[PDB]
């Protein structure tokens, strides 16, 4: 509550320079981010507390009940610091000190063991990560698989011609209209 400037967050050392006149620093978002302590001329650095979107990775509810959790846009070493009673809105703080964690560009997901083999995507994550319920049975997040590679034996005197043909019926579905409604 610096001079009545109510706010919440964590304050660190700020390398930004204030002129002796200037008191409050403002960002592009037009809000305070740095304050000058009345007792100590050193400039603080206001930034909001640790937060972010909470994503749950779940298979079919009937299939299983383990649900790995992915944390959005946070360093994976920060959420262990966040663990404290009356300090975290979720009461399920067990996963923060939970199973083996894997860190990606979309934060680190907890409750799923990263397997370094390749599988086709079942549940999208982002940045080439796809969690799935595989083999006892748990949740594993792997890297995106683009399909098995297939070299072509190209040669400047070689040609390949199909000696046989097959007819396969392919389906395709398109909506044409929704329900007419009135209010």
Partner 1 sequence: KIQDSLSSTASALGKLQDVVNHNAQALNTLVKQLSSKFGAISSVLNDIFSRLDKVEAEVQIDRLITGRLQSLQTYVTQQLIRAAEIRASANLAATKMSECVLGQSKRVDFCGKGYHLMSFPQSAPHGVVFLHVTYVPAQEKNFTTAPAICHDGKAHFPREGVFVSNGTHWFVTQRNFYEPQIITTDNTFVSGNCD
Partner 2 sequence: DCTMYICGDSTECSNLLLQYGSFCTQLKRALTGIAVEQDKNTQEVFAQVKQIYKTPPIKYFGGFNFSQILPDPSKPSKRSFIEDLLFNKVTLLICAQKFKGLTVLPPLLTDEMIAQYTSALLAGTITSGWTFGAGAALQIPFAMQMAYRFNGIGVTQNVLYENQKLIANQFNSAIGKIQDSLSSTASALGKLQDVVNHNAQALNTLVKQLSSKFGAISSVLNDIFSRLDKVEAEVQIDRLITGRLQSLQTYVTQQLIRAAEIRASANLAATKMSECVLGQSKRVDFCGKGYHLMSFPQSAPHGVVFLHVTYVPAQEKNFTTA
Ligand X SMILES: *[C@@H]1O[C@H](CO)[C@@H](O)[C@H](O)[C@H]1NC(C)=O
123 binds, among ligand X, partner 1, partner 2, none (CB under 5 to 8 A by kind): none
Judged by CB, which is closer to partner 1: 40, or 150?
150
* 156 Rama class: left (phi>0) / alpha (psi -120 to 50) / beta: alpha
Tokens linked to 79: 């959420």
Tokens linked to 97: 């000190």
Q: Which does 11 bind (CB under 5 to 8 A by kind): partner 1, partner 2, ligand X, none?
A: none
The answer to whether residue 135 forms part of the interface with ligand X (CB under 6 A) is: no
d(CA 76, CA 73): 9
Rounded to a whole number of angstroms, the CA Rg of the chain reads 27
- Count of alpha carbons within 13 angstroms of residue 92, beta-carbon side: 8
Interface region with partner 2, contact rule CB under 8 A, candidates 58-66, 94-102, 117-125, 133-141 = 117-125
In the bound complex, what is the minimum distance in angstroms from residue 123's beta carbon to partner 1? 14
Chain centroid to Cα 54, Å, comes to 9
**Comparison of 155 and 170: residue with beta carbon closer to ligand X:** 155
**Nearest distance from C-beta of residue 54 to ligand X, angstroms:** 16
The correct pick among 43, 44, 68, 108 for binding ligand X (CB under 6 A) is 108
Integer angstrom CA distances of residue 117 from 140, 141, 143, 153: 10, 10, 8, 27
| Residue with nearest beta carbon to ligand X | 62
Shortest distance in whole angstroms from residue 141 CB to ligand X: 13
Instruction: State phi, psi for 80 to the nearest 5 degrees.
Output: -60, -35
What dihedral do alpha carbons 15, 18, 23, 24 form, nearest 10°? -50
Residue from 19, 85, 152, 178 that binds partner 2 (CB under 8 A)?
A: 152
The DSSP 8-state label assigned to residue 63 in this structure reads T
As a whole number of angstroms, the distance between CA 2 and CA 23 comes to 11
When asked if residue 154 is in the footprint of partner 2 (CB under 8 A), the reply is: yes
Q: Interface residues with ligand X (CB under 6 A)? A: 60, 62-63, 75-77, 103, 108, 116, 156-157
Q: Interface residues with partner 2 (CB under 8 A)? A: 6-8, 27-31, 47-48, 51-53, 72-73, 105-106, 121, 124-128, 130, 144, 146-162
């Amino acid at each position: 509550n610096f001079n009545g400037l109510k706010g919440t967050g964590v304050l660190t050392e700020s390398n930004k320079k204030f002129l002796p006149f200037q008191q409050f620093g403002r960002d592009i978002a037009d809000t305070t981010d740095a304050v000058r302590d009345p007792q100590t001329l050193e400039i603080l650095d206001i930034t909001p507390c640790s937060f972010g979107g909470v994503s749950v990775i779940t298979p079919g509810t009937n299939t299983s009940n383990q649900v790995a959790v992915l944390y959005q846009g946070v360093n994976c070493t920060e959420v262990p610091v966040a663990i404290h009673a009356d300090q975290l809105t979720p009461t399920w703080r067990v996963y923060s000190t939970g199973s083996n964690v894997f860190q990606t560009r979309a934060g680190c997901l907890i409750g799923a063991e990263y397997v370094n083999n390749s599988y086709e995507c079942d549940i999208p994550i982002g940045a080439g990560i796809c969690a799935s319920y595989q083999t006892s049975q748990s949740i594993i997040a792997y890297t995106m698989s683009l399909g098995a590679e297939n070299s072509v034996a190209y040669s400047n005197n070689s040609i390949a011609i199909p000696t046989n043909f097959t007819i396969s019926v392919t389906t395709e579905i398109l909506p044409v209209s929704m329900t007419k409604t009135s209010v």
